[PDB]
Amino acid sequence: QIVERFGFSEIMRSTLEKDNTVGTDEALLDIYRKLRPGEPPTKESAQTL
Amino acid sequence: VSGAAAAEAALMRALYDEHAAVLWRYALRLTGDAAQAEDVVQETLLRAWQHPEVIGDTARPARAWLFTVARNMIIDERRSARFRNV
RNA sequence: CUCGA
DNA sequence: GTGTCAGTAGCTGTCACGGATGC
DNA sequence: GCATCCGTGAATCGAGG
């Protein structure tokens, strides 16, 4: 669906390609450990904030 | 044997990684000074290591005990020793 | 902080 | 002596330049 | 071997609150 919305730009395709991790529960924890480092990452503890 | 004297540490380093970085923020909001918070955190967790009757019941909230320990120490610093100089 | 050459 | 959730404010509205720092 | 990012610098004196 992301490729569906931003497909008209090569820059967004290249972003999704050069991406590191894929998955709804993966990038979530990737954000959690950069925003509030040093804490155990729960799926719901990140889904909440 | 020696594995037990090592188990002590491996038990403390396991509560650190889950409660220290969170306790810090509490004393932070209450003191507005990350330095004193850094101090209070270590004081608290040292007492914790000194009071094993709290972590032994793993199934009970330990963080909840920690917060009160800290909250008390901060006001102990807001004692007469603070009123005059701060 | 506000201001003068 | 302490024990159920118990979790910053603030903030990027400067810039040119050189060289160690780092992928 | 080279781009990033760190650290350095950025007029003078003066008044009052």
UniProtKB/TrEMBL annotation, chain B:
Coiled coil: none annotated. Residues 15-82 form the RNA polymerase sigma-70 region domain. It comes from the Bacteria. Belongs to the sigma-70 factor family. ECF subfamily. This is RNA polymerase sigma factor. It comes from Mycobacterium tuberculosis. The lineage of its organism: Bacteria, Bacillati, Actinomycetota, Actinomycetes, Mycobacteriales. The gene is sigL.
